[PDB]
C-alpha cells in the first residue's frame, strides 16, 4: 500500500495493469491485516480474489508430519518414531 | 510530439477493436458528452463505488466516436490517455517534471480541440510535487484541455474535496450501480468475448443464474464485477476438466497416491503401537481404491455410451442425405418415410441417447459460489440427500430423547437445503429452555458437529458476562475516535469471514435487558453494523438461544414466566419456542452406554480396554437419581466409582497397556 | 398502489401520500424536510413494511433507502457513529 509516499502517488501504479490481467500476482497475507490495511482501500481490494485457508485437523497434521519426517531426521543425525509424531500431533 | 512518450491512445486502440463492448448506460454517456462539449469549464469527472462501471463508459464513448454517433461538435477527435506515473520517472533535477508537464500542456493547447486528455485515477494528481497539479488550474478554468476522470466515491472526499479551489473546476457525474435485470443484458452481450478465450460454450440459463445467485450471497462487492467473475471462473474450471481427467477422479487418485506411500513407509516400523496403525490405514486404502475403479468404470459408461450414438447422429445425417436423394429421384414414398419416419425416429432415439459436460451451466455457477464464500447452494448431489434424510438418527447418537427439538432443529435444515425457505431471514432462530442437565447445550453442540465435523468451528458467546448495559460494545465494536476502534466487533468480525457457522447465545436470561434490544434486529432481518459502518449478513446462520427460565413449571408456570421476562416485540421474532422435558429412568440406561463408550475411547490412548457387566451397567442407571439435576450427577458417579480405583491401580503396577479389567457389582459397590 | 404491499391503515397511507404531492405541486415549505413523521402502535402491523413500500415507490429498488437501527445507540459516545469524529482523532478520514 505505502510503497513510496510524501498525497497518494505510489502503490497504485499497478492498479491499471491488474484489471487487464497483465500480471498475475499471487500473494499471501495474514487474516487480521487484510481488513486493517487493504480493505480500507476498496478501490484496490476489488482486483483480488480471496482463497480462505482453514486450519487442518489432527488426522491431516499426522500425515503432514509423516511426510516431513525426513528433513529433520537428516539434519540432526538421529531417527524418529511414528509414535512421537502421533503423540506430538495430539498434545 | 511529447505525448508519444507519456501517453497511449485510447481511440487508436479502439480503432483496431482491442477494447471490450459497452452496453447500456445511455443517460450517463449523453450527460458526459453534453458536459464535455460546453464553452468553459467543460470537463466531467465520473464517480461512484468501485466496480459499477466507470472506465467502461469512457471506453464506450471512445468506440462511439470511432463509430460516429456523436454530434459534429465532437466527430473526428482523438482521446489521449495521460499517465502521471511515466512523467515523474526521472525528475531528480529541480525543473524536470515542470518542464515535462509544461511541454505536454502546451502541445495539447496547440491543437484546436483534436485531443481530449483522459486521466484515470485522477485523485493521484494532487501529488507529484516533492507546486504540482497546480499549473493546470489556469488552463482548466478556460476549457482549453478537456479532462475526463474516474475516481472511486470515497477517495474523492479524501484527496480532492480537501482542495475546493480545485474541485470547483470539475463537473460530477454520479454513476449508480445497475440491477439484476440489466446485469443480465450486460452478460448476454459479453458472453461471446469469453466463449472465444476459453474454448467452451456458455448457456443463457447460466448467464441468468450467475446474476440472480450472486446478488443474495456475495454482498461485500458491487454489481457487474461480482457477476462476471463467476462466469469466467466457471469457464476456466470447465476447460481444466476438458483438458485433463475430471475432478472427483483427480482428488481420489491423488490421495490414494499418498496413502500408498504412507503405508509403505509405515510398514518398516519396529513397534507394536504402529501395528494397529498400519492395520487401519490398510483398510481405508482398500475402501478408496474400490471407489476409484467404480467411478473410473462409471466414467466409461458415459464416455462411450454417448460415443456409440455419435455414428447414429452421423447416421441421422446419412438419413438426411437419403431424403435429399429420395426427393432427387422423385421418390415421394421415401420423402415422407424419411421426413416422418427414419430421420425423426432416429432423432427421438438420439434424444433418448443423450447421457447428461461440454458447456457451463446453471450448476457450475453454484459450484463456484459454494467454493467461494463457503455457503452451500447446490442441488443435494445424491450423497447429501440420503444423509439429510436420516438426521434424527444421526443426532440421536449424542442426544437421547428430545424428539420435540430434534424434529424442529433438523427441520429448518431440510427446508433450507431444498430451496424453500425465506431468502432474507436466518435459516433458523429459536430458543429452547427447560430444567437443567437435560442437554439444551449438548444439542447445539451435537448439531454443529453434524455440519462442519468440528464442534469448535461455531461462534459461541457466553451471555452471562453481559451484566451491564455498557458491555454491549464488546460485540458491536466501539464508535470511531475511541480507544479500541481499529478492532471492530467481536461477534460481527467473526461472522464476516465464514457466513455459515451456527451462533450460540448461551444462558441468555442473565444478560442485562438491552443486549436483547441489540439482538432485536439480528433476527427477522439478519443485519447489524459495527463501528466502521459495515453491514454483516446473518441470513445463513442458525441462531440458538439457551436458557433456564421457569425451572420446574409444567407448561404454564414457565410459558407465563418467559412472557413476563421478554417483551412481545422480541418473543414475536423467534420461531417456535421449544420446551424440553425431564429425564425418565428408562432413557438413562442409554446415557450410561454413551458415557462408558466415551470413557473407553479416552482409555484407548493406552491400548487399554475394559469389560463391563450388564448388572453394573444398569446399577449405574439405578443410582442415576434425583430428576432435578438432570444427567450430570451420573458423570460424577462414574468417576467416583470406576475411574477412581482404576487410577489408584494404574499407577500402582498390576495394570499395564494391552490389558483389560472387567467391572462386576459387589453387593453394594463396584469391585474390579 | 401502496395498497399492493400494505393492507389497511388508510389513515397512514393517506397522510404518507399527501406528503409527496404537496411537494411536487411546489407548495410545501422549502425550509423543513419533505416530511418527517413517526409511526407507533402494536407489533406486527406494518409500521416497518410501509416505509419499505414507500421507499420502493420512488426508486424501484428496496435497498436504496439509507437505514440506521436505533437499537445500538445506547450511550452518548455512540452519537459520533453517525456524525464522524472531531478533528484529529483515530477515525477521521471516514
Ligand atoms: N456497461 C458495461 N458493459 C460492459 N462491460 C461492463 C460494463 N460495466 C462494467 N463492465 C465490466 O465490468 C468490469 C468493470 O470494470 P471497470 O468499470 O473498469 O471498473 P471501474 O468501474 O473502473 O471501477 P474502478 O474504480 O476502476 S476499480 C470490467 O470487466 C468491465 O468490462
Ligand atoms: N439428554 C441428554 N443426552 C445426552 N447427554 C446428556 C443429556 N443430558 C445430559 N447429558 C450429558 O450431560 C452434559 C450435558 O449438559 P448440558 O446440556 O451442557 O447442560 P445444560 O443442558 O446446558 O443445562 P444448563 O441449564 O446449561 S446447567 C453432557 O456431558 C452430556 O453428556
Ligand atoms: N399490514 C401488513 N401488510 C402486509 N404484510 C404485513 C403487514 N403487517 C405485517 N406484515 C408482514 O410482517 C412482516 C413485517 O412486520 P412489521 O409489522 O413490519 O414489523 P414491525 O412493523 O417492525 O413491527 P415491530 O413492532 O417493529 S416487530 C413482513 O413479513 C410482512 O409480510
From Swiss-Prot, chain A:
It is found in: Cytoplasm. It comes from the Bacteria. Disulfide bonds: none annotated. Homohexamer. The oligomerization is ATP-dependent. Part of a stress-induced multi-chaperone system, it is involved in the recovery of the cell from heat-induced damage, in cooperation with DnaK, DnaJ and GrpE. Acts before DnaK, in the processing of protein aggregates. Protein binding stimulates the ATPase activity; ATP hydrolysis unfolds the denatured protein aggregates, which probably helps expose new hydrophobic binding sites on the surface of ClpB-bound aggregates, contributing to the solubilization and refolding of denatured protein aggregates by DnaK. Belongs to the ClpA/ClpB family. The Clp repeat (R) domain probably functions as a substrate-discriminating domain, recruiting aggregated proteins to the ClpB hexamer and/or stabilizing bound proteins. The NBD2 domain is responsible for oligomerization, whereas the NBD1 domain stabilizes the hexamer probably in an ATP-dependent manner. The movement of the coiled-coil domain is essential for ClpB ability to rescue proteins from an aggregated state, probably by pulling apart large aggregated proteins, which are bound between the coiled-coils motifs of adjacent ClpB subunits in the functional hexamer. This is Chaperone protein ClpB. It comes from Mycobacterium tuberculosis (strain CDC 1551 / Oshkosh).
UniProtKB/Swiss-Prot annotation, chain B:
Residues 1-177 are annotated as: NBD1. Residues 384-582 are annotated as: NBD2. Signal peptide: none annotated. It comes from the Bacteria. GO terms for biological process: cellular response to heat; protein refolding. GO terms for molecular function: ATP binding; ATP hydrolysis activity. Residues 228-356 form a coiled coil. Residues 178-374 are annotated as: Linker. Residues 583-672 are annotated as: C-terminal. Its main location: cytoplasm. The Clp repeat (R) domain probably functions as a substrate-discriminating domain, recruiting aggregated proteins to the ClpB hexamer and/or stabilizing bound proteins. The NBD2 domain is responsible for oligomerization, whereas the NBD1 domain stabilizes the hexamer probably in an ATP-dependent manner. The movement of the coiled-coil domain is essential for ClpB ability to rescue proteins from an aggregated state, probably by pulling apart large aggregated proteins, which are bound between the coiled-coils motifs of adjacent ClpB subunits in the functional hexamer. Homohexamer. The oligomerization is ATP-dependent. This is Chaperone protein ClpB.
Amino acid at each position: 500500500v505505502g510503497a513510496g509516499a510524501t498525497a497518494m502517488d505510489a502503490g497504485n501504479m499497478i492498479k491499471p495493469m491488474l484489471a487487464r490481467g497483465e500480471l498475475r500476482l499471487v500473494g499471501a497475507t495474514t487474516l487480521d491485516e487484510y481488513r486493517k490495511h487493504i480493505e480500507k482501500d476498496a478501490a484496490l481490494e476489488r482486483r483480488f480474489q480471496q482463497v480462505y485457508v482453514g486450519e487442518p485437523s489432527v488426522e491431516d497434521t499426522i500425515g503432514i508430519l509423516r511426510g516431513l519426517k525426513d528433513r529433520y531426521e537428516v539434519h540432526h543425525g538421529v531417527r524418529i518414531t511414528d509414535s512421537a509424531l502421533v503423540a506430538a500431533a495430539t498434545l | 510530439q511529447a505525448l508519444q512518450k507519456y501517453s497511449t491512445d485510447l481511440t487508436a486502440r479502439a480503432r483496431e477493436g482491442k477494447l471490450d463492448p459497452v452496453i447500456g448506460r445511455d443517460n450517463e454517456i449523453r450527460r458526459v458528452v453534453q458536459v464535455l462539449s460546453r464553452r468553459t469549464k467543460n470537463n466531467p469527472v465520473l464517480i461512484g463505488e468501485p466496480g459499477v462501471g466507470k472506465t467502461a463508459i469512457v471506453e464506450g464513448l471512445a468506440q462511439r466516436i470511432v463509430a460516429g454517433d456523436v454530434p459534429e461538435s465532437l466527430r473526428d477527435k482523438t482521446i489521449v490517455a495521460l499517465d502521471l506515473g511515466s512523467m515523474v520517472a526521472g525528475s531528480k533535477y529541480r525543473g524536470e517534471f515542470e518542464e515535462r508537464l509544461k511541454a505536454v500542456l502546451d502541445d495539447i493547447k496547440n491543437s484546436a480541440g483534436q485531443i481530449i486528455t483522459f486521466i484515470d485515477e485522477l485523485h493521484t494528481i494532487v501529488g507529484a510535487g516533492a507546486d504540482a497539479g497546480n499549473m493546470i488550474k489556469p488552463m482548466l478554468a478556460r476549457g482549453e484541455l478537456r479532462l475526463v476522470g474516474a475516481t472511486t466515491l470515497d477517495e474523492y472526499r479524501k484527496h480532492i474535496e480537501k482542495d475546493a479551489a480545485l474541485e470547483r473546476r470539475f463537473q460530477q457525474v454520479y454513476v449508480g450501480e445497475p440491477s439484476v435485470e440489466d446485469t443480465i443484458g450486460i452478460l448476454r452481450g459479453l458472453k461471446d468475448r469469453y466463449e472465444v478465450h476459453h474454448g467452451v460454450r456458455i448457456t443463457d440459463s447460466a448467464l441468468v443464474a450467475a446474476a440472480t445467485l450472486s446478488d443474495r450471497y456475495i454482498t461485500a462487492r458491487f454489481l457487474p464485477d461480482k457477476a462476471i467473475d463467476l462466469v469466467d471462473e466457471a469457464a476456466s474450471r470447465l476447460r481444466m476438466e476438458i483438458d485433463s481427467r475430471p475432478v472427483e477422479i483427480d482428488e481420489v487418485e491423488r490421495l490414494v497416491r499418498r496413502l500408498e506411500i504412507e503405508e509403505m513407509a509405515l510398514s518398516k516400523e519396529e513397534d507394536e503401537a504402529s501395528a494397529e496403525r498400519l492395520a487401519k490405514l490398510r483398510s481405508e486404502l482398500a475402501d478408496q481404491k474400490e471407489k476409484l475403479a467404480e467411478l473410473t468404470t462409471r466414467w466409461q459408461n458415459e464416455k462411450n455410451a454417448i460415443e456409440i450414438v455419435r455414428d447414429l447422429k452421423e447416421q441421422l445425417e446419412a438419413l438426411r442425405g437419403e431424403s435429399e436423394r429420395a426427393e432427387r429421384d422423385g421418390d415421394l414414398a421415401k420423402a415422407a418415410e424419411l421426413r416422418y419416419g427414419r430421420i425423426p425416429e432416429v432423432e427421438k432415439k438420439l434424444d433418448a441417447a443423450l447421457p447428461q459436460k461440454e458447456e457451463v451451466g446453471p450448476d457450475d455457477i453454484a459450484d463456484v459460489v459454494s467454493a467461494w464464500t463457503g455457503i452451500p447452494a447446490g442441488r443435494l448431489l445424491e450423497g447429501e440427500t440420503a444423509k439429510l434424510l436420516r438426521m434424527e438418527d444421526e443426532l440421536g447418537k449424542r442426544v437421547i430423547g428430545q424428539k420435540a427439538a430434534v424434529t424442529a432443529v433438523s427441520d429448518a435444515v431440510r427446508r433450507s437445503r431444498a430451496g424453500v425457505s425465506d431468502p432474507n431471514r436466518p435459516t433458523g432462530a429459536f430458543m429452547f429452555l427447560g430444567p437443567t442437565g437435560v442437554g439444551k447445550t449438548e444439542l447445539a453442540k451435537a448439531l454443529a458437529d453434524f455440519l462442519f465435523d468440528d464442534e469448535r468451528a461455531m461462534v459461541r458467546i457466553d451471555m452471562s458476562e453481559y451484566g451491564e448495559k455498557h458491555t454491549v460494545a464488546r460485540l458491536i465494536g466501539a464508535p470511531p475516535g475511541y480507544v479500541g476502534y481499529e478492532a471492530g466487533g467481536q461477534l460481527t468480525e467473526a461472522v464476516r469471514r465464514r457466513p455459515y457457522t451456527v451462533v450460540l447465545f448461551d444462558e441468555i436470561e442473565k444478560a442485562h435487558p438491552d443486549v436483547f434490544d441489540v439482538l432485536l434486529q439480528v433476527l427477522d432481518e439478519g443485519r447489524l453494523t459495527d463501528g466502521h459502518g459495515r453491514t454483516v449478513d446473518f441470513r445463513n446462520t442458525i441462531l440458538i438461544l439457551t436458557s433456564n427460565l421457569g425451572s420446574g413449571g409444567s407448561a404454564e408456570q414457565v410459558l407465563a414466566a418467559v412472557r413476563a421476562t421478554f417483551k412481545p416485540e422480541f418473543i414475536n421474532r423467534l420461531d417456535d419456542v421449544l420446551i424440553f422435558e425431564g429425564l425418565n429412568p428408562e432413557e438413562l440406561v442409554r446415557i450410561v452406554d454413551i458415557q462408558l463408550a466415551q470413557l473407553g475411547k479416552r482409555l484407548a490412548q493406552r491400548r487399554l480396554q475394559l469389560q463391563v457387566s450388564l448388572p453394573a451397567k444398569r446399577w449405574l442407571a439405578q443410582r442415576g437419581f434425583d430428576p432435578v439435576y438432570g444427567a450430570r450427577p451420573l458423570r460424577r458417579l462414574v468417576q467416583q466409582a470406576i475411574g477412581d480405583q482404576l487410577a489408584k491401580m494404574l499407577l500402582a503396577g498390576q495394570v499395564h497397556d494391552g490389558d483389560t479389567v472387567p467391572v462386576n457389582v459387589s453387593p453394594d459397590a463396584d469391585s474390579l
